[PDB]
Amino acid sequence: MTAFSTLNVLPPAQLTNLNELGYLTMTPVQAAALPAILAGKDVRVQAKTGSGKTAAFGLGLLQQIDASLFQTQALVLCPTRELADQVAGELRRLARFLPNTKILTLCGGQPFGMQRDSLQHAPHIIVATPGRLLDHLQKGTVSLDALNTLVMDEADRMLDMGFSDAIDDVIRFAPASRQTLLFSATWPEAIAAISGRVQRDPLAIEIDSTDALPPIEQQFYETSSKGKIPLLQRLLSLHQPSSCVVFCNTKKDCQAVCDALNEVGQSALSLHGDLEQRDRDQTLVRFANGSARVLVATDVAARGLDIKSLELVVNFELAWDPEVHVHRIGRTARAGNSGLAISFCAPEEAQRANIISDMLQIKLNWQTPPANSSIATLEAEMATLCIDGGKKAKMRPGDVLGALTGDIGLDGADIGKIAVHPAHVYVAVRQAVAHKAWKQLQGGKIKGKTCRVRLLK
Amino acid sequence: GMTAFSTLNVLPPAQLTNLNELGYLTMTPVQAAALPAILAGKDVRVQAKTGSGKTAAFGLGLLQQIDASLFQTQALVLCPTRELADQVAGELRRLARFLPNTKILTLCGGQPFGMQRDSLQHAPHIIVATPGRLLDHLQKGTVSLDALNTLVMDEADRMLDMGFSDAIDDVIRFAPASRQTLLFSATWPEAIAAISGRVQRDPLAIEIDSTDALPPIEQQFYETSSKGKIPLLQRLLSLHQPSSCVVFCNTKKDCQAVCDALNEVGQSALSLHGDLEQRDRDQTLVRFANGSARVLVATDVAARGLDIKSLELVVNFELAWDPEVHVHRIGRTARAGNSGLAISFCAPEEAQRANIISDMLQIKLNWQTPPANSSIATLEAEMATLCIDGGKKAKMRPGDVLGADIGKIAVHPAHVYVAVRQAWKQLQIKGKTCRVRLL
RNA sequence: GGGAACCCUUCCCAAAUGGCUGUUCGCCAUUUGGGAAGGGUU
RNA sequence: GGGAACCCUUCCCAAUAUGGCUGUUCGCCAUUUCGGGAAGGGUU
């Protein structure tokens, strides 16, 4: 039985679901905030990165859901589309105990009409970005009149000056009689001091201080701005990370670093706001399932993204905000693992490095690189097939896996992550078998129907 | 005397060629008389006998005022039955071939409301509808008559009866006050004629034929008891051996009972009444029209408007309550210049109905003696109907589906019906393969 | 700077809504989905 | 009477309409239907 039983609130169906999902022990933040959340209290939570906040507020809000009432009862706000999709997926996993629970995500990039159509049957839980959610609110396709609880993940980001007007506009559509949860790994005392405007007598649950990170080893390298790309290529060759995320402060630098890494054959994809949304989603899929070694991103990937066993984070340029520095490195060392975060520091970034040293109360570990080091190739172990259909075509992972193991004649150990999206299914297969799987699935059949299959770039 | 459509001096050469292609060689009397005033924009109330071209008479008039570039509703036509609405729409489509990209939509019950709502996003130029579903669409804002030029009521004496009065009034409140209004019918009791002027604006009354001037229909009456009508009917069918026949009854119960009594004696008979599924009604009409059945037993849902080509025989199993309904029934035969036969049964209690018919038509009844009472003869259907899934939404023009072993081809919105000689397994078209059912 | 939204064009591809000759395998027309590329919004 | 429209219930069949469900497939459920039948009730 799972430790969650000590809460003495969750139904046995949810306890069994947690046991099946492997949630055998409550993380500190779950143990600390779930009583108060299930009691209906407003909370502002500060726990370290990759320590279970999603389940912390998800179990809480799921406990107060009436599946028979097809109106929206829970609303979760995220700062980026990929993070919205991610926490929506985790909530759907946590909601298996309660059958026929509709969890819908509302972000830009998707066409507005398909979402308007899916909203005719109101979803129980909405996970959303502020722009598209406010668009749907002003046009009367979403009602918050039945809203029990409103969650703001990355709440210090949702309450900054950028999102402030959009948030104030959204809350105007929400009841005053609502539970309001705020979760983050960082709380600048400014955003913390103003956060009371959206809550009603909240409990401050600050279990992890600002300097209490997960087991992340940090290393800093002095370098001129011009030497950074050579140094990055040499360091990637030295470390040989199974996966790595490189962060830049601008999309121009992001794409430039991606291209410079690819010209030396270090398998790299780029993720920033100028990409189309299909490209953003597919890029994240491919990096997560092993179809690329390095992901180069702007701060659109700094927060919340849960990439499993990510081995390395590199700060090409230190982030403007030390809070964002903490979130970047937090992409590694999640769910109890360790990680490494290398950071470059040019003379213009001295102030950023000093503020990081002060905030984390650590003496920075400056590494000198080897005198000479060659540049090595980094090839991806996997490649991603994109099958047309998704949840709209009722494709569950068992169908793709059984078709791959049987009819097409592929080994069960040559297929990695299966990610079922609303309109497509992404499969990871080893690079040797990729073209074979593509050609045979072309004229093959999954779940009886014949489908369209693309090999992603 | 003959008059060509060019004598109207209004119709474009495209429309003149279209009429010549469709076999409208010379105008009928109702066309020659009503079309000048209709094209001049006058409201008209028109009488003309059955099977004399009233449909084309008002259709050409309203098509002359359509602007195909403006994709709003500009012409509305109301019908008493769904099958008649479909038929009038089809004739209007054939007449509208001179005008490319002309949307004529039919709004009737039985068909789902959602597909019609979707089709209404691109507003049609012409709507042919029954008042129920049309009013349902109007009140729900899916149809707008703001740009309406012409409103037409076929079978207007029925459209203005007490049953349809309120629905019609409801529909008119959505239409513009400045509109052209055309009322057409084969019959006009002077009471309903007097009340009809409320929907019109200075109408012109054109009574082409006096009430007793019918098409060349031979009328024969038979005395019979109530029971025994079915035996006498079976015997008359065995005697005359009609290629196509229509049997009218006053009740759906009698209709279905007569239909099944005809079927159990081996006489191919279909039924048509309001208690049927709408797909069933449409398929029944298609099968009876293309020759897949010899006899059609129907209620007064088939009394008005329907144009079955070269229908050979009509019988009144029971005389209609109203003589106006009687003339509409027999009018199903002897259409477009053909002759016909109309046999009527007369029980003791319907004798006064027979007498009122005699007075209205100013004809003395020709009573006939019963022929014989032996050997119920067979009446096999010459054709059989197959249903292809596809229709107009699958872009199936008749030529695609397409010798002389196949009769009529009926291209519907969702299906295509074809009559073959007395195909399925070999078909089970236009590149794509399709589902085929045997009716 | 980085996210989070949108409007204005202007051409492709595909599909909703119709039109087109009783010897098929297609051609139009309007609309809306992305595929773009052009400018503008917070 | 006969048409032209519904509304209640209450069971079928159907709908990638809207969702839910085991990582060795070809399926199983839920709601809605401005989708079709049945079987009683009513209404215009």
Ligand SMILES: Nc1ncnc2c1ncn2[C@@H]1O[C@H](COP(=O)(O)OP(=O)(O)O)[C@@H](O)[C@H]1O
């Ligand atoms: N109780 C638990 N036991 C084991 N794993 C857990 C537990 N709770 C969460 N996880 C997993 O650990 C990771 C933490 O993800 P996340 O919820 O995003 O942490 P955070 O939002 O605080 O950064 C996820 O993969 C989550 O599924």
Ligand SMILES: Nc1ncnc2c1ncn2[C@@H]1O[C@H](COP(=O)(O)OP(=O)(O)O)[C@@H](O)[C@H]1O
């Ligand atoms: N001018 C014409 N020449 C030849 N046939 C015609 C002409 N006008 C109509 N018809 C045909 O004669 C029949 C009359 O159908 P219809 O117009 O509905 O008669 P009704 O006057 O009773 O409404 C139909 O087959 C129609 O196509």
Ligand code: BEF
């Ligand atoms: F704090 Be986590 F990475 F959302």
Ligand code: BEF
């Ligand atoms: F008068 Be007809 F038969 F429409």
Ligand SMILES: [Mg+2]
């Ligand atoms: Mg998180």
Ligand SMILES: [Mg+2]
């Ligand atoms: Mg007529």
